[PDB]
Amino acid sequence: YTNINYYKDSASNSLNRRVRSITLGNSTITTQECANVVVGYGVWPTYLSDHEATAVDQPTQPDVATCRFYTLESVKWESSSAGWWWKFPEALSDMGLFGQNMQYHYLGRTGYTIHVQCNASKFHQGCLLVVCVPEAEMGAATTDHAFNHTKLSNIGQAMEFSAKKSTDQTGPQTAVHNAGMGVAVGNLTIFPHQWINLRTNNSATIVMPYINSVPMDNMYRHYNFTLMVIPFAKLEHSPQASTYVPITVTVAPMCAEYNGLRLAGHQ
Amino acid sequence: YTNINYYKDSASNSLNRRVRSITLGNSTITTQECANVVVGYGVWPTYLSDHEATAVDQPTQPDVATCRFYTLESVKWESSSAGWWWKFPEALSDMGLFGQNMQYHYLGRTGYTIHVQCNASKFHQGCLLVVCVPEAEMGAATTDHAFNHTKLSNIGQAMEFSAKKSTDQTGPQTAVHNAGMGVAVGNLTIFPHQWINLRTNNSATIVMPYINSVPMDNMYRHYNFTLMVIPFAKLEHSPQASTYVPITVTVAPMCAEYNGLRLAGHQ
Amino acid sequence: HVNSMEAYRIPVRPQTSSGEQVFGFQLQPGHDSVLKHTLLGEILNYYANWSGSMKLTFMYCGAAMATGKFLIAYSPPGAGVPGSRRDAMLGTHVIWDVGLQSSCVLCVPWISQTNYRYV
């Protein structure tokens, strides 16, 4: 442990040894019954600082027009239903003045808040897993073959998993127990997640920051994170109960900045 | 002069007896040769205060994306050319993220800066009049007949006057010496104006505030002001000189606010 | 024209309709074959990364009695390339009169997602 340094470089060294609502814009969701709000990796979504921001152009922050609650589509929960995934910000690419700022700006940095809501009765049973996965590079269905950009994510459409495996020639491997990444689906509880147990929970609220290796990135060729809703316990009821149990996703961008103003994309 | 008041109301009373550039956004015009900048009725364009703002929704101020220099089309100055008029904000209704904020917002308040540029040589002669007329209710060509909304102003197209009178059945009276308002065209020097004398001037820069009876108004059914470019001395040169002398208009919104966020207009 | 002095000789002329393009190139110093063999380009080619703002300077070598304006515009990568004066006015631009000044400086700002760009 003499700890002397012969060379001049650092890389030449040795090893180192109820009523709780959210009012975003002109929009209000309601409620959490004083339950819980999962926030990211413990980090609230903030703006860009000056140690960051390699760009020299001045940022565009609308703060009201783009940062309100955008209600996505509604999907149908069945007994033989495997799961769904939405890839962001592709799912918000056409909604309001948020998707309009994306076309005129080269870079873009934003955080989100995800509110997955699915109500039932006391006589329904089931359990969902709502998980937000950053950088989910998915595997193709037919290996050694490239696959299409409209099979990964359409514009705001909920791409769904499958109970069996997928033999498609141009899409991703949608086996739900491999979760599209070749990984065990029980181990997706590292990412910011929350369960929806139909006997006690009724909702899930995740607040994700901007997680990327660069401070600002183009949002038309890079999926920042995907949102996977996978039921682990399947929906079961009596045949006299209400059979249509829908799942609505409501998502809202938080602290959105843009840079590089030019004409409309995205060629 | 006893000055006593018998009644309790106020309305029941008696009578009362070089290098000077402008860098707006990512955009720079150049220059004025230390000449002049005409500003409005002596009033710089500002935001809305709290004595005003009858609306309760929070305003949307983008400040970079919408408030840069937008270069309109180029028109051709000839000898037998009467004039032109652009009606605002209809002329900026399709340009950039300014025309995109108009579709999603009910109200809108903005000021402008108008930079009309037309260069020539020392051997050309002529004089333009660049005037900004608020609330120019124009008269129809065929009287007792209603006239179309695309004859008053197309989207950003330069509607032109005529040397003779107009016998149209669905447009405005475009006699240039009556200036479309039934008024003597020599008396349009009340409105904020600036001459372009081709021997000394080369440009004109007008900065107009928001002039309206209400603090915020819908910008898809009301023309706030029109911009008239009328040559008083006609363009003359030798036949060996350059015959094509164009006129370019460059305009930029200043301190634009919006309220009433809803879906896209304008039905 | 690269075997003569006409390679440095960007031509302008009186037009018939305005808004037309004068020239145009990509902003790839060290790789694009316009600004590759310049003095900035021969120095980046000894390297494999560059970063910072470039400065373009013009000089109108015309008559002393001619007058006109231009629209020199930089556009961020995004999508795609502008094909009109109406399209290349939304990006970074300046307006340069040749009756007032003969030289115009356009500081091309550094907009990127990364800290460096490959040569």
Residue B184 token pair? 């003597």
Tokens coding A227? 């949102």
Cβ neighbours for B6, distance < 8 A, ≥ 6 positions apart: none
Chain B, nearest residue to C86 by Cα: B71
**Stretch (H or E) spanning C95:** strand C92-97
Encoded tokens for C57: 């300077």
Q: Return the closest-CA partner of residue B113 out of B212, B255, B215.
A: B255
Q: What's the CA gap between B45 and B47, in Å, rounded?
A: 7
Dihedral through CA B196, CA B201, CA B205, CA B211, nearest 10?
A: -40
- The DSSP annotation for C16-68 comes to SSSS---------TTTSTTSSSSTTHHHHTT-S-B-S-EEEE----S-SS---
In angstroms, rounded to a whole number, what is the distance separating the alpha carbons of residues C118 and C50? 6
Q: Does A66 touch chain B (CB under 8 A)?
A: no
Record the tokens describing residue C119, joined without a space.
Answer: 């040569």
Amino acid at B80: S
- Both structure tokens of B244: 């094509």
Torsion of CA C22, C27, C30, C34, to 10 degrees: -10
Gap between the Cα atoms of A176 and B31, Å rounded: 64
Q: How far is CA C7 from CA A233, C44, C54, C90, C96, in A?
A: 72, 22, 21, 30, 23
- Residues B208 and B225: their CA atoms lie apart, in Å, by 9
Q: Which residues contact A83 (CB under 8 A, 6 or more apart)?
A: A160, A161, A176, A228, A229, A230, A231
The first and second tokens of residue A214, run together, are 């660069």
Q: Do the Cβ atoms of B117 and C91 come within 8 Å? A: no
Residue B134: is the preceding peptide bond cis (ω within 30°)? Answer: no
Rg of chain B over Cα atoms, rounded to whole angstroms, equals: 21
- Cα separation of A40 and A112, whole Å? 10
Cross-chain Cβ contact A263/C76 below 8 Å = no
Is C68 within 8 Å of B121 when comparing Cβ atoms? Answer: no
| Interface chains of chain C (3 or more CB pairs under 8 Å) | A, B
| Selection from B68, B65, B64, B152 nearest residue B100 by Cα | B65
**C-alpha distance from residue A28 to each of A23, A130, A250 (Å):** 5, 21, 11
Q: Could you tell me the CA-to-CA distances from A117 to A24, A252, B263 in Å, in that order?
A: 17, 14, 24
| DSSP secondary structure of A34-57 | S---EETTS-------SSS----S
Neighbours of chain B (3+ CB pairs under 8 A): A, C
Nearest to B170 by CA among B151, B147, B154: B147
Could you tell me the resolution of this structure in angstroms?
A: 3.4
**Distance between CA A172 and CA B145 in Å, rounded?**
64
**Would you say B29 and B21 are in contact if contact means Cβ atoms under 8 Å apart?**
yes
Residue C16's identity, in one-letter code, is T
What was the elucidation method? Answer: cryo-EM
Six token digits for residue B142: 């065929």
**Range list of β-strands (E), A50-192:** 70-77, 84-88, 105-117, 125-134, 159-160
H or E segment to which residue B99 belongs = helix B96-103
Residues written for chain B:
267
Question: Who contacts B226 (Cβ-Cβ below 8 Å, separation ≥6)?
Answer: B85, B86, B87, B88, B132, B133, B136, B153
Cα dist. B64→A48, A126, A265 in Å? 17, 49, 19
Assess contact for A205 and A36: CB atoms under 8 A.
Answer: yes
* Cα B245 from Cα B124, distance rounded (Å): 10
Beta bridge partners of B115: B205, B250
Chain A positions touching B258 (Cβ under 8 A) are: 65
Residue entry with tokens 């239903």: A81
